[PDB]
């Protein structure tokens, strides 16, 4: 069903994160881009999102207090400079992926969140 | 509980086979490696799997054969040779994901892997 979900974005890149909810529309999916972690946060309290994908310097305690709040929310953790440590820590904390930027494409990149939905 | 879980390694190398298992004992789980991708499916019949990771070329037709029949075993595809529409193929044919090889490390592969069984 067109629209039924809805993906919040947060990435300080806005070319990057048009091309994302521009893919992202390709498969039905709503998605909101905010280059704020702080609006993100708020915006997941007052709008209902399925998924949200974050890049930020900050993500991993946003993580925590994202799992705690909204418990069913997939959290998507991506990274310019992925580590092992940050992985593990991201996985520890509850996020549901770890992705390394750049992307392999935004086609893939899509289909991950598809899956990441299902 | 330890070795409540069972994962099943199909990798050709058998000393990055030996590293991965020697990281999953180290959180409880149990894993067996084979080099065979026939053998692997086999073995998928006559014991009980939680999660298959797959390394091979025809890993993909394996991945829509094992969600058909055995539809909770968790799937993971890796591949020496990522690309964007192998990647889009696995995520759609439904693997739960698909995992650039070289590894990142074995305990972030670990963590990944368990959060995989979450």
């Given at each position: 069903p067109?629209?039924?979900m809805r993906v919040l974005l947060i990435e300080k890149n806005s070319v990057l994160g048009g091309e994302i909810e521009k893919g992202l529309n390709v498969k039905g999916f709503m998605a909101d881009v905010t280059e704020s972690l702080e609006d993100g946060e708020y915006l997941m309290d007052i709008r209902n999102y399925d998924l949200v994908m974050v890049s930020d310097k900050n993500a991993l305690s946003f993580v925590s207090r994202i799992k705690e709040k909204h418990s069913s929310i997939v959290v998507?953790?991506?990274s310019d400079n992925p580590?092992?440590?940050?992985?593990?820590?991201?996985?520890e904390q509850g996020?549901?992926?770890?992705?390394a930027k750049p992307?392999?494409?935004i086609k893939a990149l899509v289909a991950r969140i598809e899956a990441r939905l299902r």
């Open positions: 067109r629209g039924s998507l953790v991506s580590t092992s440590e940050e992985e593990v820590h991201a996985f996020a549901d992926d770890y992705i992307y392999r494409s």
